[PDB]
Structures are given as C-alpha cells and as structure tokens.
Subunit: 292 residues, 4 copies
C-alpha cells in the first residue's frame, strides 16, 4: 500500500512576477492546472491516497481546486511548508501521513509523458523494498542531481548540482520509497545550500545496494516548467498532442474512470458543470467511446 | 481635462475551465508576466494614472496582492467588484463614484495591444475632450464582436453586436474612451436578450449624436485577446518572439512609469532589488543606464 | 530482409504557394529536412535498402540531399511518380525494386515519435507473414482510412474517408507487407477519387485474416505535416524535445552509428563538414558520450 | 525611380542539413516562401524593377517561382553570386542592372512588419540623395553592424561585429542608396573576414555627412530567419497575425493590386489556379471587400 506526496510549494522568485499572484503549480499548462499533471502521474501509479504540500498561503487555493478527492475516487490531504528547505523535508512534514506505508514523492511542476509510462510507474510502484528513481538525458545536468554509471550501465554515484557533471543523466522529480525514507530523512543535515537533500536520501539507499535507477528513455517527455520559455513550450507540447489525438493529457476524471475508481454515473455528474466547454464535452464523450 | 481609467477584469472563464478554476484568467501569464499587465500598460501609455480595477468578488484580493495600491509605480489603483458578469457597460455603473466628473476610459483585462505609434494613437484619443473614441480592427471572426459598418467614404455609420451576418470584418476592440456622458448613458440601458448591458448600446448612443469617433486600427497593430487556450498560447508566443529579439520587454509597468517620469531612478532601482535574481529584475536595472529610443 | 519505400511525391497544391519551389518533403521540420523523419522510421525498423519515390521534377533534389546512402550505411534508390495516383501505386512503381522480399511503405511527410517505438517497429518488421498497420486515435478520422473494431477490440473493417466514421482510429501512413502486396496492387482498380487505395490493399489482407492492426497508443506521437499550422506545431514539438534533452530526433548519422551500420571513424568524417554548426557538433559529441 | 535588389544567395552552412537541398530563401515562413517577405518590402517601397541575386545553382528555381514579374506588374531580373563574398558584392553584380538610378538592397531572409512601415519605406525611397538605413534595438548587436549615437541621438560611427558593442542598435538588412554606391563598392577591399562589407559602404556615406540613420522602433518587427529557432518563431509570428486578422502578410498579389500595378481582372486570373486553397480563396475575397 503506497501513499503519495506532491510537493507543490517552493518560492517562485525566479518566474516572478508572473508567479506573484499565485503559485506556479496552479498555473495552467495549456488547458489545465499544472498540478494536474503530477497528480495524474501518481494516479497512474495506482496511488489513491495523496498528501499535497505547499506554502501556507496557497494551501487554501490548492484545496479550493482539488477538494478532498472523493469526486475522483481519491483521498487528498493537505499540509504546509512554511519555508522551501529541501525536497527531503517533504518526508518530515509527511511523516505521520505516511505512517508505516511505502510512499512516493513527485514534484508539483514536473510533467511526464510517454508510451507505457503506466507500466513504468507500475513496476516502480510494485517494488516492496528499496527505492526507485529515474534518470533522463538532458541539456544542463548541472541544474540537477546527476548520476554516474559504470561501464555496464549500472549507477555508481550521485552528485547534486556538480560543477562538472559526470554524465548528462539527471534524476527526475519522481521518487518511490519503502519505509526507510522517513528515518533517513530524520538524520539529514542541511547542505551548504541550506536544504535537506533528496539526493542525500537517494545516496543512502544507493550505499546499501537498494537504490534502483531506471533510465527514462528519450522517447518519454520529462518537462519541468522552470522557466517562462519552458512553461511556454510545455503548454505547446500538450496542445500539439491534444489537438491531433482528440484525447487529453492528465485529465483526472478520465484516469479515475479508466481505473474504475469512479463509475459512469459519477463521471456524468462531474461533466455537467463543465458541459459548456471543451473539457466537459470531452468527459461526456468518454462515456460512449471505447478508447484503447 | 483629466482622464480616469477602468480595467474590467472580472468575468467567468467558464469556457477556459478548468484552467481558470483556481485563478482568474487575467492573472495568468502571457509569456513572462501577468495578463493584466498588458491592458494596465495600455492605460498607462494613455497618460492615465488613476485607475479602477474591477473583478469578481472572489479574485479582488489576488488582484490587490499583485498590484497593490499603485503608489510603487506612481499610480493610484482602486478596486471594485462585479458579482455577476452582466455586461461591459456595468463597469460604468460600478465605477460611477470613481469616475465622478472626469473623462474616462475602459479597457478589457484580457485584451492585448501592440504596435508602432500605438502611444500616439492613445495620445490622440486621450486628448479629445468630448465625445467618445473607439477602434476598429480587421478580424477573422467579427461575428464574435460588436461590428462596424462603414459608408463608401470610410466613415462609420452603424454598429451591431454579434450579428448573424456581419456587414464588415471590422470589430470594435475592447478599448474605449468616453467623456462625461457615459455614466448617464449607462444608467438608462436595458439588458439585451443576452441579458447584458451592452457597450455597443453605449457606443451607438454616442454615434447617434455625431459624437462617436471610430478610428481604424490598421493591420500593422496587434490586437490579441486571449480567449482560448490556443490564442493564449499564441499570444505568449507572440510576446516571447518580440522580447527575445529586441532585448526589450512588452508591457512592463516599471519601465513605463519610469519613462513617463512617474517614478525616478531611485524608485526604479528599489523596485528591481527584490527581482534581481531573475531576468525581469535584471532588465529593470539595465534600464537605468541605457538610452532606449 | 525487408525493403523499404518512402513515398514522397504528391502534389502540395493544398500547400501552395509555400511549396511552389520545392517538394513538401524537403522542407525542414525545425532543424532537419522532413524526409529525415520517416527515413529514420525505416532505419529503426532495421531496413537498409530503400527506394525513394517522388515527383520527376524533385528526384534530383532528393538525390542531392541523401545520396546513394553509403554514407549512412544505406542503399538508397530512386524512382519517380509522374502523377499522384495513390499510395498503392508505390507497389507498382516499386515492383522490381521489391522483387521477392518483404517490404514496408512509409509516407514522406509522416512523423512518428515515442518510447519503445523501435520495439514497435521491430515486431512488425520481423513478422514473416501478412501485413501490419497501425491504428491511432485522432480528431479527424474522416480524413483517413478509418478502422472498425468489434467488442473485443479486433479489427473487422476499413473505410477510406467515410462520411460517418465508425471510430476515431485512423490508419497511420506506415505499412509492412509480405509478398502478397504486389500482386494485390496489380489487381486494384481506381476508386471514384481516381486513386489506387492502400485501404483496398489493407482490406485484401483483412479479408483473409492476414491483416494485423496494432493500436498505436496516445503515448506516441503521429504527426503529419499536412497543413501550415500543423507543420508549425510539428517543428515546435521537435524543438521542445530537442532543447530539453540535448539529443536530436531523426538524425540518420546517429541511428546508423547506434546500429553499427557505420563506425566511429565514419561518424567523425560525417561531422567534419558540419563542424561549424549544432548538427555537426552534435555528431562529434556522440563519439564520446554514452547515450542510453 | 529606384531599382531594387534582393540578395538571396549565401550559404546555409549554419542551417544545414535543413538547407542542403534548397536555398533557405525558398523555404516557407508559415504559409508562403520566405523570399516573398522582402519582395513585398520593396514592392511597398514602390519599387517595381528588381534584380534577384542568388546561388548559381538555385536561380532556376527562383525564376521558376517568381517568373519575369509581369504577372504581378513587376519587372524581375536575375543574377548570380558564385560565392558569398559580402553584401557589398551585390552592387558589383548589380552594377549594370542599376545603371544611373537610385537603388535599394534588401536581404532575402529578412522579414519586416509594422504599422506605417509603408510610410517609413516611402520616406526613404523618395529621398533623392545619400543613403538611408535603419537601426533597431536587439539582444545580440554583436552579430551585426552596430551604430553609435551621440547625446543628441545622432549617429556618429559604425562597427561591424564588434566584440564590445557601443549600443544595442543593429543596422537592419534594408538599405537605400543614391548613385554613389557602385563606385564606393568598387573601391572596397575585403575585410579580414574576407568579404566586401556593407558597413564599409555605410561608413563611406557617413564620413561625408550623407548617411541617414533612422531608428526603427520597438513597435516594428525585424526578424531574421537565421536559425532554426528563429525561422520557427517567425513562422509563428506570421501565423498568429494571419489567423487573428483574416489578412495575410507579404502576399504580392495583394500589394500589386492595392498599388494598381495589376487590375481586378488580373487578380482574378492569378487566383484561379490557387482556388482550391486558402491562399487562392483569400485573393478572391480581396476582389469584393474593402480593406483599409
Ligand atoms: C527546496 C524546495 C523546493 N520546492 C519546490 C519548488 C520548485 O517548484 C521545485 C524544485 O525546487 P528546486 O530549487 O528546483 O529543487 P532542487 O534545486 O533541490 O532541484 C532538485 O531538482 C530535483 C528534480 C533533483 O532530483 C534534485 O536532485 C535537485 O536537483 O520544487 C518545494 O516545494 N519545497 C522545497 O523545500
Ligand atoms: C536511438 C534513437 C532513437 N530515436 C527515436 C526513436 C523513437 O521515436 C524515440 C525513442 O526511441 P526508442 O529507442 O524506441 O525508445 P527509448 O530510447 O525512449 O527507450 C529506450 O530506453 C532505453 C533506456 C532502453 O534501454 C531501451 O530498451 C528503450 O526502452 O526516439 C532517434 O530519433 N534517434 C536515435 O538515435
Ligand atoms: C461581460 C463581462 C466580461 N468581462 C470580461 C470577460 C472576458 O474577460 C472579456 C470579454 O468578455 P465577452 O463576453 O467576450 O464580452 P462581450 O461578449 O461583451 O464582447 C465585447 O467584445 C468586445 C471586444 C467588443 O468591443 C464589444 O462590442 C463586445 O462585443 O471581458 C467582465 O470582466 N465582466 C463582464 O461583465
Ligand atoms: C516605451 C514603451 C513602449 N511600449 C510599447 C507600446 C506600443 O505598443 C509599442 C510601440 O511603442 P510606441 O511608443 O507606440 O512606438 P515606437 O516606440 O515603435 O516608435 C517610436 O519610434 C521612436 C524611435 C520614435 O522617436 C518615436 O516617435 C516612436 O515612433 O511599444 C511598451 O510596451 N513599453 C514601453 O516602455
Ligand atoms: C497593404 C499591405 C501591408 N502589408 C504590411 C505593410 C506593413 O508592414 C504593415 C502595415 O501596413 P502599413 O500600410 O505600413 O500600416 P497600416 O496598414 O497598419 O496602417 C495604415 O493604417 C491605415 C488605416 C491608414 O489609413 C494608413 O494611413 C496606415 O496608417 O503591413 C502587407 O503585408 N500586405 C499588404 O497588402
Ligand atoms: C496520393 C499520393 C500522395 N503522396 C503524398 C502526398 C502527401 O504528402 C501524402 C498523403 O497524401 P494524401 O493525398 O493525404 O493521401 P490519402 O488521402 O490516400 O491519405 C492516406 O493516409 C494514410 C495516412 C492512410 O493510411 C490512408 O488510408 C489515406 O487516408 O502522400 C504521394 O507522394 N504520392 C501520391 O500518389
Ligand atoms: C490512459 C491515460 C494515459 N495518460 C498518459 C499516460 C502516458 O503519459 C500516456 C499514455 O501512456 P500509457 O497509457 O502508459 O501508454 P499508451 O496509452 O501509449 O500505450 C498503451 O497503448 C495501449 C493500447 C496498450 O494496450 C498498453 O499496453 C499501452 O501500450 O498518456 C493520460 O494522460 N490520460 C489517460 O487517461
Ligand atoms: C555575405 C552574403 C550573405 N548572403 C545572405 C546569407 C544570409 O541569408 C544573409 C545574412 O548574411 P550574414 O552572413 O548574416 O551577413 P552579415 O554577417 O554580412 O550580416 C550583416 O548583417 C546585416 C543585417 C547588417 O546590416 C550588416 O551590418 C552585417 O552584419 O545574407 C548572400 O546571399 N550573399 C552573401 O555574399
């Protein structure tokens, strides 16, 4: 039984002033709020119980937007992070939420897409021990935690924001942990940057041969909307997919319905209030179209 | 005389839902800054410093959170609320006491204007002391808008709102200049079948006294309205292209307030500090020591 | 041992005047010529021997661009289509090129991209019987040959450009055939439209229970650059992936090298002439970076 | 009476391999061939007699595309540049074409757009002495000939590709000359770069107080399609204007018709062949819609 966390806080000083009125994760990527995407990633992982962490000031808004989850077959909860002191904090804040269960962490501005991504999630999720993460070839590795591989393609070390990256493989912002993560987090000390580092967590698992690093191929999309230009591109990527296919990406109603977490009657009900527009119309259509 | 401005930034996004489920359209970014900044900037360029921002009761706080009282940019921003999107013309009823006995000007919060000499264009409308001024712009789908009919000499003779059969492809954009007759005109309007108070009815009133001036806004200008997911995309992109080629930014209030001497160098510096770690802040700093024509 | 054909003729009247001076297929999608994309598709299918069909007028230009193929480990050949009389014509024009081998046909303006697309291709290409095609959910199936599924998801019929589509599954423009296709194409009669229809070819296989229709999931991208707008989006989809990953899509030098059809020396030499730009720089970098 | 030259040769080494088969200036920007853009610029300046300069290899195609000009009321001629030895070369190659007339030069991959651009053109074109150029604020002036201003805003010097730009005003690729340009070009010596430099021409005029530098404001768009990314953006810019307005940019048929260089009958005739598509339909529509 794995629980999930979405870490949707952070300042956004960068993308100011665009993000001065509202956290980034509530801004739309093309046609729907950013947080939907990562939300849909956990859903696809088979996770239904989820803790949304954010700034004190934007929780309400997150809640306004997502409610308790029941309408989509979910159980959402909320927690607050007063200061953006490190991904790993998510586990301290989320400790009692997690209890004795396996868990998963995903960044609220991280957008993933691709063929068999669902199976990919499935495999990580279904592991009952250790940790799983993902490595993705990128242009500037140095921004992220970077992984080093030996000659046989096995991961052998990690370095956070190295001056000189040993590879272009970055650790994406999706993480699956077993019951060691809380305690590992509790023993962490702030790095010179001043944060509690997920890399440090990942390393701890790696130092006991329990970290599993799956390469995420160039066929998948891992987009993070870290800059105005990237925010733009992402919105576009999705618009492109959406207008060709006639299907939508990261639409929670659909996933819930496909997973049988809600039934047709429920889906109809969710659609009424959105009937005057594309989105509602899409949901209706889903009730009478087999989509493979 | 002096002119006050209104930015009507309420309205549903019901269309745009669910994107707009968490915040109002007008607070979403067009590329690199909040939408409302654009029309805000339009009024500023019109020489208008005293401005009333109308929005849904629920989003006023967030508008306020973003723009403050205006004093930082040498402006005076007030705020008001529109419980229900009952027509552009309601603005004047809502902003009656804000307007008082001055000339005014209404702009739509999701309307984006850009082009060479747009400043002189504003200047002219703004400096007219009587009557009203609006703008006509060739578009693909005039039927979505209030449409203007012209005689053989290019003089506007009629207006129809959302006609089934448009008499021309010239739409009235969402930027309007009025003298002191607008409030009363607005106070005598009855809702159309759509159920709204129609700015077109307002415009027609002025036209029916030979006091509506309709300036053609040529194809050289951009009038974009971010009405759909796609158009929102295109706009952001339209802006991104100009900005990355020029090294200048569109609709950046700090810059306009400085250029118009509404704030001084010291004030501009101080506005920049908090944003230094990023492009936006860096830009402001750069403006202190570069002559930009 | 399967041979490939790229059909890259066709008029672009629709696309005039943009394509008045040069065939559609030689226009760039973002940073390399459109034909490279489908070219890459066949390469990834394991196909090295390929016939490029085009208008009489533009062949020389296609030749000028791709050469005989030796440089990328291919054997490219050329043929001409005076008139755009149907996809199926490719098999009459290509009859002797094909001889007694398995084959595949891909449209020159069809761009495919996704995770495990290579395995997808592998499976279809290694089949030693019947035909394989792909079905993809789109917004305007009426533009294409549409497939009909029964309640167990098995294909039961096809209709080219139907007034009322039985489903939103369009048959993409990628086709794998066994030795039956030539004789089948030889007995086709022109449809009312005046063309020899691949749908009729697809149907012939279907009528014997030898047509395999694989669903291509929403995780893959099937884009076809059939309108100004879409050509735009496509270019932009590619740029988005390329600028995030630091990898390039459909870059034949790379694919050849990855498949060991050319060696590092060959790759170095291919890059020299392009050294003063990104494309060349990319090639070089491939010689010293492991890319998974 | 001024004559115009469009310089559309050059190497695309940078944009390889995209441009290996055809010259960039024959690729489309969104919905029509690039060269249409500059072509329209000259037309808007009231210039009807034009020399198109290009590689030896692509002239034929340029000619195929644009004809002798008579269909659009122009008089087009052609010449060739075996090697891209500098913008000033256009004047040696174009000497006899120019004879004793005033002239103008525009780059073939330079796209201009804006309100009252036509009047801007008119003013420069009607000057009967000296030279006129335009200065425009850009992000990367070091890529261009840069201009330096005094405290009154008067141009005082030019540097081509300066390590350290004195300003961010670049000299765009649009130039108007009186009868001194040829002889000035005739006495140029190749810079270290190995080209005859238009900046050197512009300086010659500047040294006699006969160079007029007009600032082209941030309201105008000066885009050059010098990189994959910018070629994209440009396409996008245009599509965005076009689909909002229902008017098209740089559509020679229209400009000629507006300037009374062709009459309605001729316009109809030009549209017939393109009737099945947007472009044609647009031309038709122009016959019965007043457009201010
Ligand atoms: C530090 C922190 C960030 N965040 C949010 C804000 C941003 O949206 C986003 C990331 O902040 P950053 O400064 O980019 O985190 P970061 O600089 O730690 O970036 C991380 O990138 C990760 C993907 C890598 O896997 C890590 O190895 C690390 O490189 O997440 C929080 O919500 N809370 C926090 O305490
Ligand atoms: C190798 C390669 C692929 N491609 C294209 C083909 C596909 O559209 C897309 C992804 O290619 P594929 O190889 O089908 O999938 P992939 O590269 O995303 O996935 C690979 O991930 C690797 C880590 C695993 O070891 C492989 O088993 C496979 O899963 O990229 C290129 O354009 N150029 C290339 O050089
Ligand atoms: C009606 C209304 C809209 N708005 C916001 C909603 C959108 O953000 C934007 C426009 O709303 P619409 O329903 O499209 O307005 P509209 O349907 O009144 O369209 C207007 O279009 C103008 C450009 C024309 O000049 C007018 O003639 C008129 O046609 O206005 C409000 O804030 N309050 C309101 O009462
Ligand atoms: C100054 C400024 C302008 N703008 C936008 C407003 C308009 O939409 C667009 C064009 O600016 P305008 O002042 O209308 O025109 P312009 O700045 O393109 O043209 C100017 O060219 C100058 C060199 C001449 O001296 C001036 O007379 C004027 O023509 O600029 C901003 O968004 N922010 C700003 O700070
Ligand atoms: C006429 C025309 C212009 N253009 C380009 C030229 C410029 O880049 C831009 C705008 O054209 P211009 O005519 O320079 O500006 P404009 O058309 O935006 O402005 C005109 O507005 C009119 C209402 C006024 O009556 C005119 O005096 C002038 O102000 O459009 C075309 O691409 N095709 C065309 O057919
Ligand atoms: C007909 C034809 C097209 N072409 C090129 C031109 C276009 O770029 C592209 C397809 O042209 P169209 O006229 O759209 O062909 P088409 O209308 O037959 O389209 C096809 O789509 C495939 C994807 C489906 O599998 C088919 O069932 C079919 O619908 O083919 C040729 O090169 N030669 C030809 O004879
Ligand atoms: C189902 C679904 C997926 N997605 C996302 C998940 C991925 O990013 C991408 C599609 O991912 P997947 O569903 O993992 O892969 P897929 O849908 O491309 O492929 C599927 O093709 C099917 C026919 C096969 O039977 C499955 O085995 C699988 O191959 O879309 C949504 O956003 N909404 C959805 O409702
Ligand atoms: C040099 C040259 C270029 N060209 C074409 C190729 C490109 O499409 C276009 C630009 O060439 P470049 O090598 O970028 O030119 P360039 O590097 O000479 O750039 C010029 O940029 C101008 C705009 C400035 O006004 C000049 O100051 C100068 O900087 O010129 C020719 O057709 N023939 C030639 O001899």
């Amino acid at each position: 039984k794995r629980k999930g966390i979405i870490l949707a806080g952070g300042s956004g000083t960068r993308l100011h002033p665009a993000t001065l009125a509202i956290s980034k994760q509530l801004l739309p990527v093309y046609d729907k709020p950013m947080i939907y995407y990562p939300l849909s990633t956990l859903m696809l992982a088979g996770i239904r119980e989820i803790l949304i962490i954010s700034t004190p000031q934007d929780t309400p808004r997150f809640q306004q937007l997502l409610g308790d989850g029941s309408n989509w077959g979910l159980d959402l909860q909320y927690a607050v992070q007063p200061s953006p002191d490190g991904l790993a904090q998510a586990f301290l804040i989320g400790e009692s939420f997690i209890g004795n269960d396996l868990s998963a962490l995903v960044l609220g501005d991280n957008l993933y897409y691709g063929h068999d991504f669902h199976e990919l999630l499935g495999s990580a999720s279904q592991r009952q021990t250790g940790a799983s993460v993902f490595a993705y070839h990128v242009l500037d590795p140095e921004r992220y935690g970077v992984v080093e591989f030996d000659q046989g393609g096995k991961a052998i070390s990690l370095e956070e924001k190295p001056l000189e990256p040993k590879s272009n493989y970055a650790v994406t912002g999706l993480y699956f942990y077993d019951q060691q993560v809380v305690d590992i987090a509790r023993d962490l000390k702030p790095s010179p940057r001043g944060e509690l580092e997920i890399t440090d967590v990942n390393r701890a698992y790696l130092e006991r041969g329990q970290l599993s690093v799956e390469i995420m191929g160039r066929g998948y999309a891992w987009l993070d909307t870290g800059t105005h230009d990237s925010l733009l591109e992402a919105g576009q990527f999705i618009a492109t997919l959406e207008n060709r296919q006639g299907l939508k990406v990261a639409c929670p109603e659909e996933i819930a319905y496909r997973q049988k977490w809600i039934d047709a009657a429920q889906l109809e009900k969710l659609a009424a209030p959105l009937a005057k527009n594309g989105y509602g119309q899409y949901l209706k259509r889903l009730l009478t179209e087999t989509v493979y």
